[PDB]
Coordinates of N, CA and C in Angstrom, one line a residue:
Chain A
X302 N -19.6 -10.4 -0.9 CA -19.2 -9.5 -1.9 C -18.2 -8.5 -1.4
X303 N -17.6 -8.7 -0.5 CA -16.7 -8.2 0.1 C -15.7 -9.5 0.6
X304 N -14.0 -9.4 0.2 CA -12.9 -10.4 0.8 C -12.8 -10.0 2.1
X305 N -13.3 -10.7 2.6 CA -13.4 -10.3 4.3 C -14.1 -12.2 5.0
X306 N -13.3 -12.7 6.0 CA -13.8 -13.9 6.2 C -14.7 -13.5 7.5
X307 N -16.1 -13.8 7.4 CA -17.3 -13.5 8.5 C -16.8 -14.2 9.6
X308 N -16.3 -15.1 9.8 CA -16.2 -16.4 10.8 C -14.8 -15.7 11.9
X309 N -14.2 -15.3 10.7 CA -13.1 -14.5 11.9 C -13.2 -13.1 12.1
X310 N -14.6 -12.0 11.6 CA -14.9 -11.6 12.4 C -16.4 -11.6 13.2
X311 N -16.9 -11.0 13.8 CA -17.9 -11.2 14.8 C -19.5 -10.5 14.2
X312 N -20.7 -10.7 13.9 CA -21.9 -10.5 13.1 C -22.0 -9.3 14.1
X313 N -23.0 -8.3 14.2 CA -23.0 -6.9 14.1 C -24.7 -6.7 14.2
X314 N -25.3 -6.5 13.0 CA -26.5 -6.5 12.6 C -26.7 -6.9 11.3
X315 N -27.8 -7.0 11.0 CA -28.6 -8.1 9.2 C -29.8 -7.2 9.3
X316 N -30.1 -6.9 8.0 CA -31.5 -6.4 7.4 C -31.2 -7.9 6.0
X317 N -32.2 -7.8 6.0 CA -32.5 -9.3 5.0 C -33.6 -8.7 4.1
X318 N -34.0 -8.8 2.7 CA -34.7 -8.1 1.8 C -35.0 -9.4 1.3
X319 N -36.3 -10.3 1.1 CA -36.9 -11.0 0.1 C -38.1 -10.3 -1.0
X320 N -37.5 -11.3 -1.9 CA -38.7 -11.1 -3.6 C -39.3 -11.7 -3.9
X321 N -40.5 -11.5 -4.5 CA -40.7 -12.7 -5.4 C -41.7 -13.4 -4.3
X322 N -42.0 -15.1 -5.0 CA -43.0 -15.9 -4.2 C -42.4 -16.5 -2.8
X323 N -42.8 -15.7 -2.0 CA -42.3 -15.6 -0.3 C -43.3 -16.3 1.0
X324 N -43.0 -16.6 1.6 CA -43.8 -17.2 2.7 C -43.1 -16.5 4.2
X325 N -44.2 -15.8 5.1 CA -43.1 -15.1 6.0 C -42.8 -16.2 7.2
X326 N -43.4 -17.3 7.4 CA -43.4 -18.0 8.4 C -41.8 -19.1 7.8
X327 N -41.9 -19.1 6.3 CA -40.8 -19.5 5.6 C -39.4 -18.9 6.4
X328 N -39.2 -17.5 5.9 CA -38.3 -16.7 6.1 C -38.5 -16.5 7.6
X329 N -39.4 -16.5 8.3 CA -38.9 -16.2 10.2 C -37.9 -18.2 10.0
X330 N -39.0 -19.2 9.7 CA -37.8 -20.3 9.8 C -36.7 -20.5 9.4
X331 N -36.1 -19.7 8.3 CA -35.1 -19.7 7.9 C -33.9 -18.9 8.8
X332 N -34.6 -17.4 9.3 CA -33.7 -16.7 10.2 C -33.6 -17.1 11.8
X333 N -34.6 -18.0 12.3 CA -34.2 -19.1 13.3 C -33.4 -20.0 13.2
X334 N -33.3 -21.0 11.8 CA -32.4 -21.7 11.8 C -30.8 -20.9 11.7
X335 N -30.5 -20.2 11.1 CA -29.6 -19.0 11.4 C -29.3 -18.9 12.7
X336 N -30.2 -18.0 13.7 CA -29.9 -18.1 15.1 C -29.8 -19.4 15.7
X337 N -30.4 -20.4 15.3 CA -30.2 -21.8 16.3 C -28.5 -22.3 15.7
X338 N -28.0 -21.6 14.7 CA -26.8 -21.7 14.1 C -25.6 -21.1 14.9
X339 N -25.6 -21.0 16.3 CA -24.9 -20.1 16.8 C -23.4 -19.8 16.8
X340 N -22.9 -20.9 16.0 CA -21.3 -20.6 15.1 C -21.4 -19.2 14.2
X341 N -22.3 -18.6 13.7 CA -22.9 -17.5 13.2 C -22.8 -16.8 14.5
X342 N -21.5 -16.4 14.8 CA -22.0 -15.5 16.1 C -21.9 -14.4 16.1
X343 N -23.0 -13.4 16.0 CA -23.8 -12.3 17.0 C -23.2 -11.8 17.9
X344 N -22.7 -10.1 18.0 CA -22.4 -9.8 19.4 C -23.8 -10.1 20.6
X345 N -23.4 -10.3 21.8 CA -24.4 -10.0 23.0 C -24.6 -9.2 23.3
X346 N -24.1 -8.3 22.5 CA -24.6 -7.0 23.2 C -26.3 -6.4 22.3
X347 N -26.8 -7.2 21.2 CA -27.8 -7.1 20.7 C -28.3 -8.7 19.9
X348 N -28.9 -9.7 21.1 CA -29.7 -10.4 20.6 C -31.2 -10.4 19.4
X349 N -31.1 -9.3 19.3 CA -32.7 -8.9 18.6 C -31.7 -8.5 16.8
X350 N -30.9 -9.1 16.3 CA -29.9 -9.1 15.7 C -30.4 -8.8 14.2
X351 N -31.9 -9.2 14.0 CA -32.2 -8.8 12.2 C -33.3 -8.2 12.5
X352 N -33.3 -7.6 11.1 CA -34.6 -6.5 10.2 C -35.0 -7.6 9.2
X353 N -36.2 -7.6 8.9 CA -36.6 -8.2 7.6 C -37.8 -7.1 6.7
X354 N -37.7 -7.7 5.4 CA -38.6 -6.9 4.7 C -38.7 -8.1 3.6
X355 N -40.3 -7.6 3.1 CA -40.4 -8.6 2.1 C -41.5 -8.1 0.6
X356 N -41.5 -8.1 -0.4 CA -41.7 -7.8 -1.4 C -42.4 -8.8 -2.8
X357 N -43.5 -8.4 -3.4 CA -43.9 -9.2 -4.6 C -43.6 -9.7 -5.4
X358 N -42.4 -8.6 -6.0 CA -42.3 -8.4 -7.0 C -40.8 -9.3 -7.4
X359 N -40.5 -10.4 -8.2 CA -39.0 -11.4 -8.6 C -38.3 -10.5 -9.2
X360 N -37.2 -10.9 -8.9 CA -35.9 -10.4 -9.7 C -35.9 -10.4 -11.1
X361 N -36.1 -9.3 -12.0 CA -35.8 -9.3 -13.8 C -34.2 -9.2 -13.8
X362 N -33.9 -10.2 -14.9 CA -32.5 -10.2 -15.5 C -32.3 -9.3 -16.3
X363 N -31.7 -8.6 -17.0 CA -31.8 -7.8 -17.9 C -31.1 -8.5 -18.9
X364 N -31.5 -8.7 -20.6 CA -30.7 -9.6 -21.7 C -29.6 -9.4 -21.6
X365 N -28.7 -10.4 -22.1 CA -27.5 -10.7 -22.3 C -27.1 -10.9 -21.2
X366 N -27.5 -11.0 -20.2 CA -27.2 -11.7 -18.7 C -26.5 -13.1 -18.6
X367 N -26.1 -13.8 -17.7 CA -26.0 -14.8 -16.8 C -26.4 -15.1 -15.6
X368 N -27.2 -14.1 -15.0 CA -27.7 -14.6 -13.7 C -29.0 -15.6 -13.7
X369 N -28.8 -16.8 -13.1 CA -30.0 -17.7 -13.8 C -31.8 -16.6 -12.5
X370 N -32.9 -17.2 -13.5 CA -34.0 -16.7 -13.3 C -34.4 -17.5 -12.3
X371 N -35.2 -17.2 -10.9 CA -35.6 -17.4 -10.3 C -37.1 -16.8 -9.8
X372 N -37.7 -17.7 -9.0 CA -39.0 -17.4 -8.6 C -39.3 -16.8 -7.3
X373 N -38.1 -16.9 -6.7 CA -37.8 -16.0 -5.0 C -36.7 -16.1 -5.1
X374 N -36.1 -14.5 -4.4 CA -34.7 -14.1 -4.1 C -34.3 -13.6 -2.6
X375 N -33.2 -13.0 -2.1 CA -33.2 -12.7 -1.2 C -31.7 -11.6 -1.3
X376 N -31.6 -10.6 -1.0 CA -30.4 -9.5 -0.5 C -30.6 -9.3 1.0
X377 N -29.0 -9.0 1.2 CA -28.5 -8.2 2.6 C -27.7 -7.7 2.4
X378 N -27.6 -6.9 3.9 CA -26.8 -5.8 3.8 C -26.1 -6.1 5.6
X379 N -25.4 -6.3 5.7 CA -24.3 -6.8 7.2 C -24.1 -6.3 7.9
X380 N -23.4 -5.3 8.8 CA -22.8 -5.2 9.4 C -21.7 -6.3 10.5
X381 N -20.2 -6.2 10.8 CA -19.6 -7.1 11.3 C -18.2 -6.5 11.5
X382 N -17.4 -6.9 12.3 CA -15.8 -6.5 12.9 C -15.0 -6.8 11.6
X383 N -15.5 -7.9 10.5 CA -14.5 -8.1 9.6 C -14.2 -7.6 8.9
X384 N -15.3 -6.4 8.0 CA -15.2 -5.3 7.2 C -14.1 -4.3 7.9
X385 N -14.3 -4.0 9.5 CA -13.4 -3.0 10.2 C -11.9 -3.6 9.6
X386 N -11.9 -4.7 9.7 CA -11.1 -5.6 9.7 C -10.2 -5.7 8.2
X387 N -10.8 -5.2 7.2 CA -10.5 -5.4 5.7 C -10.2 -3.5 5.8
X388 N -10.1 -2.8 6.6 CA -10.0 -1.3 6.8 C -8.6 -1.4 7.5
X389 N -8.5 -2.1 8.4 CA -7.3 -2.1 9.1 C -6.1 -1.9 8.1
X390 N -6.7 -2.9 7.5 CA -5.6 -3.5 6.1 C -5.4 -1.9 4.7
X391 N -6.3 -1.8 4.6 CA -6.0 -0.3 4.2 C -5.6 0.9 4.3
X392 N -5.6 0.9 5.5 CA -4.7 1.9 6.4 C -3.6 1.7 7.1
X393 N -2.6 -0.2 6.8 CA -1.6 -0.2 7.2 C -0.7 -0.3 5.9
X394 N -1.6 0.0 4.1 CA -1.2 -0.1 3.1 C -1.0 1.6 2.9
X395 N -2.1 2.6 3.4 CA -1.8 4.4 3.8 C -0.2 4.4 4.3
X396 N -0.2 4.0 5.8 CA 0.6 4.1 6.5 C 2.1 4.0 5.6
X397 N 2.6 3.1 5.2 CA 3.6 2.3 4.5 C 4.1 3.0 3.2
X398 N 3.0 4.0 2.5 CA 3.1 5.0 1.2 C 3.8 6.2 2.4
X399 N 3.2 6.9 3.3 CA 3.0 7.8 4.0 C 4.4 7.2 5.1
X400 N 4.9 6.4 5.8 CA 6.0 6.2 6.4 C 7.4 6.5 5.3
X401 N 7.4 6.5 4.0 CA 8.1 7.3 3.0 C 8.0 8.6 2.4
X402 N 6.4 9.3 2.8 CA 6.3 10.2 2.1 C 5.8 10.1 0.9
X403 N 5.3 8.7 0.4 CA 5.4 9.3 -1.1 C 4.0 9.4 -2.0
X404 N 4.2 10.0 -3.1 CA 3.0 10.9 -3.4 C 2.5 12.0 -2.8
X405 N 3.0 12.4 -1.6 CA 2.3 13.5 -1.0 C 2.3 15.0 -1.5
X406 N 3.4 15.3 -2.9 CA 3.8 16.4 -3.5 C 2.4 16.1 -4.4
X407 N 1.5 15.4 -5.3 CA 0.1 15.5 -6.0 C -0.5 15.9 -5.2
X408 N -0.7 16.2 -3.9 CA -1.9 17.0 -3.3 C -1.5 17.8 -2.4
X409 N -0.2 17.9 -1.5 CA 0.1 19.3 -1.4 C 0.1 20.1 -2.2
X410 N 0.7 19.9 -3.5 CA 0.4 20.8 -4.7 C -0.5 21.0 -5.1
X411 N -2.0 20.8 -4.4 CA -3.4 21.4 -4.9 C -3.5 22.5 -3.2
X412 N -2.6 22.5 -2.5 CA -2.9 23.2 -1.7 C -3.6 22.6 0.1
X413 N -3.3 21.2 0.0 CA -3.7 20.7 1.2 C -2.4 21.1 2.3
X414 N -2.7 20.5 3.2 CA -1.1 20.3 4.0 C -0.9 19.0 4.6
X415 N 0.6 18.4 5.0 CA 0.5 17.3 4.5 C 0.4 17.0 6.2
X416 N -0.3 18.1 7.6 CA -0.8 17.6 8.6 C -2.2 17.0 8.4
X417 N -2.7 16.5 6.9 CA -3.7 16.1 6.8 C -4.1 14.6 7.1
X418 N -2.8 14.3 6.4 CA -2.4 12.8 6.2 C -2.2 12.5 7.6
X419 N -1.7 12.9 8.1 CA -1.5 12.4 9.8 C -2.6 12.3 10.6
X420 N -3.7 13.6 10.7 CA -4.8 13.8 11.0 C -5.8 12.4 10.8
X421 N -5.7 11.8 9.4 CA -6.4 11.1 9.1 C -6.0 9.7 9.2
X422 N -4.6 9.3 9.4 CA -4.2 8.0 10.4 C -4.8 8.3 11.8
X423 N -4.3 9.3 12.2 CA -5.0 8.5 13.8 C -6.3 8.4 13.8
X424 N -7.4 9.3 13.0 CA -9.0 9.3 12.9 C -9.4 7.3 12.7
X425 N -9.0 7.1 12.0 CA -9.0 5.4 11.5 C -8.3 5.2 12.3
X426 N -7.3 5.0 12.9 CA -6.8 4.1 14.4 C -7.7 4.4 15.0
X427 N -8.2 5.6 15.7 CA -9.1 5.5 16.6 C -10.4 5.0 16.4
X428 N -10.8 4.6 14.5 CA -12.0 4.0 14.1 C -11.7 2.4 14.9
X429 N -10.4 2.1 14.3 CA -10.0 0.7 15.0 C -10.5 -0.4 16.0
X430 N -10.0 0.6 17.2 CA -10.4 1.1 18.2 C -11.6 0.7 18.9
X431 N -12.2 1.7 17.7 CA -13.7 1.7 18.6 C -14.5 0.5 18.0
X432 N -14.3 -0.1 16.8 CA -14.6 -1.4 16.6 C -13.5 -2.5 17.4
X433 N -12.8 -2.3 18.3 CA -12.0 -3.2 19.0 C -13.2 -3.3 20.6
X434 N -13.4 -2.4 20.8 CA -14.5 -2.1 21.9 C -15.6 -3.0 21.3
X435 N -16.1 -2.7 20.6 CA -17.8 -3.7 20.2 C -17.4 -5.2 20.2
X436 N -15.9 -5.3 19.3 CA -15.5 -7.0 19.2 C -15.5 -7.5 20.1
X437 N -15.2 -6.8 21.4 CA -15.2 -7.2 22.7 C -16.8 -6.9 23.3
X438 N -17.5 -8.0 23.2 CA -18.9 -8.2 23.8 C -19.3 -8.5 24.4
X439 N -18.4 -8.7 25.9 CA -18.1 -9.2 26.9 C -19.4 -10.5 27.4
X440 N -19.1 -11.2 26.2 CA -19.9 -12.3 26.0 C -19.6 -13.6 27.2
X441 N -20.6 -14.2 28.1 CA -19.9 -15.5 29.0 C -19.7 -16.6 27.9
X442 N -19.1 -17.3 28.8 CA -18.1 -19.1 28.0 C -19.1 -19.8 28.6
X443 N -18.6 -21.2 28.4 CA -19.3 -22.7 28.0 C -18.8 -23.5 29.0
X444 N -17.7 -23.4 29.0 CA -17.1 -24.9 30.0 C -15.6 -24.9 29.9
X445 N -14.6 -25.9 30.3 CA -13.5 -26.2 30.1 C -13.1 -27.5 29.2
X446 N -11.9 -27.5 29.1 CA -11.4 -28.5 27.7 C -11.5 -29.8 28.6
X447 N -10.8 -29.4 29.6 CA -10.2 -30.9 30.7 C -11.4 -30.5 32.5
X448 N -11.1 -31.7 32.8 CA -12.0 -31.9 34.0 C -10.9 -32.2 35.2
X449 N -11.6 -33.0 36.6 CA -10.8 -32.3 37.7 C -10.7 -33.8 38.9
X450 N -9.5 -33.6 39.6 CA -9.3 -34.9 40.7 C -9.8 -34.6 42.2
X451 N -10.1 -35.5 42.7 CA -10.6 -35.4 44.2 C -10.0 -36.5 44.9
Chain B
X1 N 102.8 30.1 -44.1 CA 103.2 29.0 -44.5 C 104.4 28.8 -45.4
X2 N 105.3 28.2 -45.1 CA 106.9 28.2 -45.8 C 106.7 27.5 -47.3
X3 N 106.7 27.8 -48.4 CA 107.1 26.8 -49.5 C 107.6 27.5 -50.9
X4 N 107.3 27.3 -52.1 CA 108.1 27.3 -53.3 C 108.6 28.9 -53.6
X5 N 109.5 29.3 -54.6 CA 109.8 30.7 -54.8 C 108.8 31.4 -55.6
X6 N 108.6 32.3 -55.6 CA 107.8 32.5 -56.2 C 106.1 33.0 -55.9
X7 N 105.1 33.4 -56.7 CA 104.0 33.4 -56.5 C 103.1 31.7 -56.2
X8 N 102.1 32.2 -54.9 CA 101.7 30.5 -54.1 C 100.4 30.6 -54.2
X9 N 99.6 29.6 -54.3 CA 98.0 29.9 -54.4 C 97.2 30.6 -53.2
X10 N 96.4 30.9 -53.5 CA 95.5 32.1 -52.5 C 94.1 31.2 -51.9
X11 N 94.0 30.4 -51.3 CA 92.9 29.2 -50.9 C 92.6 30.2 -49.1
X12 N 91.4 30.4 -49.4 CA 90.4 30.6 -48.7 C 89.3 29.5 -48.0
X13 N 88.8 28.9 -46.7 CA 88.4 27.5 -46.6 C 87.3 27.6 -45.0
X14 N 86.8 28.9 -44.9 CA 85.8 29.4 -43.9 C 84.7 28.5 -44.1
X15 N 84.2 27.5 -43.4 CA 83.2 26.4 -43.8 C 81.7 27.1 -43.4
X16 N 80.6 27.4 -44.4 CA 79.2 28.2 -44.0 C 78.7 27.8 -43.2
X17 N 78.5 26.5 -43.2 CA 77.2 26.3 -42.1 C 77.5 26.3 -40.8
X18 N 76.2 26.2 -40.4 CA 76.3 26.3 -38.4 C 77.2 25.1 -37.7
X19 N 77.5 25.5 -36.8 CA 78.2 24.2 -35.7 C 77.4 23.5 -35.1
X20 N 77.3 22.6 -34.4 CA 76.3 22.4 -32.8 C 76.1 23.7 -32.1
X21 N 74.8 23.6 -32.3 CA 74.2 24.8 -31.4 C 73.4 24.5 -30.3
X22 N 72.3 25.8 -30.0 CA 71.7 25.5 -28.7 C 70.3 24.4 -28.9
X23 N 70.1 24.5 -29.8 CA 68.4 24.2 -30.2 C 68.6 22.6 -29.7
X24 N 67.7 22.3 -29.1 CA 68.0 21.1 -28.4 C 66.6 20.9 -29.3
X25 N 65.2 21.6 -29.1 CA 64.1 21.6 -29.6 C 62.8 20.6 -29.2
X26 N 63.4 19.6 -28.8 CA 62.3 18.5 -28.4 C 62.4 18.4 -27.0
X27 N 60.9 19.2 -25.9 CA 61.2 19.3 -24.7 C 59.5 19.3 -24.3
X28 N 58.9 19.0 -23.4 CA 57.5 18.8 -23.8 C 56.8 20.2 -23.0
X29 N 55.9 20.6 -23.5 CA 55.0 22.2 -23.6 C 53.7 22.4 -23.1
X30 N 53.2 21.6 -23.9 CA 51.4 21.4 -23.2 C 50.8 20.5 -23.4
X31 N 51.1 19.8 -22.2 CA 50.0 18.7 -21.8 C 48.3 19.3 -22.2
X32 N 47.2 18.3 -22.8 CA 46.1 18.6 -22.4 C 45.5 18.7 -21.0
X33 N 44.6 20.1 -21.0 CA 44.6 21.1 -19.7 C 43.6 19.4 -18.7
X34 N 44.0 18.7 -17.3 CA 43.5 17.9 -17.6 C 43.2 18.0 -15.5
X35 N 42.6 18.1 -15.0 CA 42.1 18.2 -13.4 C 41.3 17.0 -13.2
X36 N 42.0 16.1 -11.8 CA 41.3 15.5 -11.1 C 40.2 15.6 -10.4
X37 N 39.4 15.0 -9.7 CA 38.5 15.2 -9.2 C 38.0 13.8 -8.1
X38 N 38.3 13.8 -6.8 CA 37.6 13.4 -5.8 C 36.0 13.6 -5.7
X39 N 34.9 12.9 -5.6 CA 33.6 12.9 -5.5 C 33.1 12.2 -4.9
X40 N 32.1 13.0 -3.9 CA 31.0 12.0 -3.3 C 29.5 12.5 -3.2
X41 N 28.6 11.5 -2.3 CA 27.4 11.6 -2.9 C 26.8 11.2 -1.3
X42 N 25.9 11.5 -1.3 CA 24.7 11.3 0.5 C 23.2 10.7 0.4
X43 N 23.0 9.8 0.5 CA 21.4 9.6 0.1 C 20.5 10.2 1.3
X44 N 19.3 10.7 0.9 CA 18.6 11.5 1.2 C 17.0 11.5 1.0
X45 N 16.3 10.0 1.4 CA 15.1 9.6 1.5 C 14.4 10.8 2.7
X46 N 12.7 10.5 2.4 CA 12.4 10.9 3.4 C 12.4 9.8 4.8
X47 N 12.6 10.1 5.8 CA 13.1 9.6 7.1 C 12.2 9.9 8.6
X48 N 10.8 9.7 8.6 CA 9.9 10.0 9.6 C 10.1 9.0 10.9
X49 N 9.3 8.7 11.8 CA 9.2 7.5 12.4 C 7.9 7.5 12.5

């Protein structure tokens, strides 16, 4: 529910919320087969990677809906480098108003100053940054493509 | 003037009107009041790096 592709960036943390008719030995197999999924990749720097919670009570539709009715559901909430990642993009769309100036007379004119705007580019580059540090998980490798002569 | 004996006629022959005179009259006066003008212009975006 966010345009942001997971795969090119890197998982973070999962809290996982189930409803409705649940089984928890269900839901641990489901979040193992997830981890045994390891193209789903997880920084190393925290293997212990989800929260779960679980709950009685099914999802009500409210009339005039389309969401079809079910007997168990499930929400999350993510963490991941690709959201940083859909930010970058926002603040190289700031940058590009702001490398013209423009608009900046609607809110100097309420009295800001416009060392705001600058203040608050480098704050988000340095957010960047510091999700460029985590994306880097100084995770080990696997092997090589090609093999070797003797 | 020499001629007949006697009483001669009395002809008077002073012609009224004017000669060629000065009035030339057609000479040109006032142009409409009319100034050129040279113009230029500088664009002037904002320019940061």
């Amino acid at each position: 529910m966010v345009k942001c592709d997971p795969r090119h960036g890197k998982y973070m943390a999962c809290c996982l919320l189930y409803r409705g008719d649940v089984v928890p030995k269900d839901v641990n197999a489901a979040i193992a087969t997830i981890k045994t999924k390891r193209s789903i990749q997880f920084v190393d720097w925290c293997p212990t990677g989800f929260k779960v919670g679980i709950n009685y009570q099914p999802p009500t539709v409210v009339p005039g809906g389309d969401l079809a009715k079910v007997q168990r559901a499930v929400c999350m909430l993510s963490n991941t480098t690709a959201i940083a990642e859909a930010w970058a993009r926002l603040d190289h769309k700031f940058d590009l108003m702001y490398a013209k100036r423009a608009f900046v007379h609607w809110y100097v004119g309420e009295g800001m100053e416009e060392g705001e705007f600058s203040e608050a580019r480098e704050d988000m580059a340095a957010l960047e940054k510091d999700y460029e540090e985590v994306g880097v998980d100084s995770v080990e490798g696997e092997g090589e493509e090609e093999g070797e002569e003797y | 003037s020499p001629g007949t004996p006697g009483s001669r006629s009395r002809t008077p022959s002073l012609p009224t009107p004017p000669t060629r005179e000065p009035k030339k009259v057609a000479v040109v006066r006032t142009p409409p009041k009319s100034p050129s003008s040279a113009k230029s212009r500088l664009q002037t975006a904002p320019v940061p790096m």
